[PDB]
């Protein structure tokens, strides 16, 4: 089962850089792309193929495709990792969109160059045999990045019906100049609504809070947000990168979490034990399962008032004791609440620690993370909706950026924005209907 990763935008490129750094340091690859084991004759206890390609000279090539419009930022990853990434997998533009532009120019450029991108992804697909699905990594605030991501997602979903699509979206924190970024994000969401099968979102406020809580002298920690995102994705993909008893595919993971394709919005959580002062707050799996329910550990700043849980799936890595998890689940079934029209959905995915990094092994040291389906996910949507619910009327500085597929045709732009807001309200209504227990 091969997974094909795609990254969009400068933020997506940084996230991919940190992610591949963590993966290489966990699989003992290094900056060159050679084996770090003293003897190559011995067998391994994992499978690197689902994420890396293998050649005759023992060279590991990451099957990642990065998109960009200004090659200045995308060259740093190759300048730090010499010969690791394939230079033919990258794509760069020439005299495209403006700095900080809307999604419109990026979408136009994507529809212009979607042929060569499709040919490249096809020539990268034909390199393997057992192909499972795609992964996308980007943000909704950036214009060109979100446009290219939306175009590629539409192409993938309407060309490949039997392949899974999982997306990672980065959302900006509540600020002043984000009035236009969220304005453009409103329509960028449209593609994630109908095309994405599984998706996770990240907010910058909670990331900065976790950074200020963990790292010293916290001033600006965008790199630490990248580290947290990479750690979350690596802990998610750990259960497939290292074989286990039950879970060996992304579909088996997502089947126990994603209901009918209108509630596939998930919120992640992670133990303060990072993966980059780390020896503290790592007592036991008991305390991990306890503080996994802490709202301060959530990756999105939400409110604590009898939260409604649809599905919960937690993964714990390390040497775990059964009695701790037994008692933890025994009391969490009483503490956590869920709607009465469904059944309790809580799952554990005890995994394996990487037997290739010189870790500090303890008898009870473990780490943990948890994904959940929440109804409070609509709050981050309302935080952007209330902004443009009152400014779109005049549109003085909104129409200047030419937010639309056509130029100066405000009628079609208004039609697109109206239908986007209507489908957003439809998602909100579908969520509140399941929350209100109307079917009961």
């Amino acid at each position: 089962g091969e997974i094909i990763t795609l990254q969009a935008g400068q933020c997506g490129n940084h996230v991919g850089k940190f992610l591949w750094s963590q993966l290489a340091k966990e699989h003992a690859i290094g900056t060159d792309g050679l084996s770090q084991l003293p003897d190559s004759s011995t067998e391994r206890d994992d499978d690197t193929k689902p994420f890396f390609r293998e050649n005759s000279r023992n060279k590991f090539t990451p099957r990642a495709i990065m998109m960009d419009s200004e090659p200045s930022v995308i060259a740093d990853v190759e300048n730090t990792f010499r010969g690791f990434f394939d230079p033919r997998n990258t794509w760069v533009a020439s005299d495209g969109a403006s700095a900080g532009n809307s999604w419109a120019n990026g979408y136009d450029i994507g529809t212009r160059n979607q042929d060569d991108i499709l040919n490249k992804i096809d020539k990268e697909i034909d390199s393997t045999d057992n192909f499972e699905g795609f992964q996308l990594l980007h943000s909704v605030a950036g214009g060109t990045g979100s446009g290219l991501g939306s175009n590629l997602l539409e192409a993938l979903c309407d060309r490949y019906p039997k392949k899974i699509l999982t997306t990672y979206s980065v959302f900006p924190a509540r600020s002043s100049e984000v009035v236009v970024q969220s304005y453009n994000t409103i329509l960028a969401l449209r593609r994630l609504i109908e095309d994405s099968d599984a998706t996770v979102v990240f907010d910058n406020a909670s990331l900065l809070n976790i950074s200020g809580k963990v790292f010293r002298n916290p001033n600006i920690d965008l790199q630490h947000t990248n580290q947290l995102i990479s750690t979350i994705i690596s802990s998610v993909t750990n259960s497939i990168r290292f074989p286990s008893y039950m879970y060996s595919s992304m579909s088996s993971i997502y089947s126990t979490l994603i209901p009918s394709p209108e509630l596939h919005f998930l919120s992640p959580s992670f133990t303060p034990f990072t993966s980059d002062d780390i020896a503290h707050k790592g007592h036991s799996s008991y305390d991990v399962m306890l503080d996994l329910l802490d709202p301060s550990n959530s990756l999105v700043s939400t409110a604590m008032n009898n939260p409604t849980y649809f599905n919960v799936y937690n993964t714990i890595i390390g040497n775990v004791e059964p009695r701790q998890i037994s008692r933890a689940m025994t009391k969490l079934q009483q503490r956590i609440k869920f709607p009465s029209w469904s059944s309790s959905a809580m799952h554990v995915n005890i995994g394996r620690r990487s037997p290739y990094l010189p870790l500090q092994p303890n008898e009870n040291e473990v780490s943990g993370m948890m994904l959940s389906n929440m109804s409070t996910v609509v709050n981050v949507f309302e935080n952007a909706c209330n902004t443009f619910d009152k400014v779109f009327a005049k549109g003085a500085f909104l129409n200047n950026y030419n937010v639309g597929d056509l130029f100066q045709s405000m009628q079609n732009v208004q039609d697109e924005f109206a239908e986007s807001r209507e489908v957003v309200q439809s998602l909100m209504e579908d969520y509140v209907a399941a929350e209100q227990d109307s079917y009961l």
């Binding site: 002298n217 001033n219 920690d221």
Partner: peptide, 20 residues
């Protein structure tokens, strides 16, 4: 954002000096 990036680089300098 340039000043923010420079101050992140200052964070990295302080960390590497602590390691030194």
């Amino acid at each position: 954002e340039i000043k923010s990036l420079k101050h992140e680089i200052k964070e990295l300098r302080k960390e590497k000096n602590d390691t030194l």
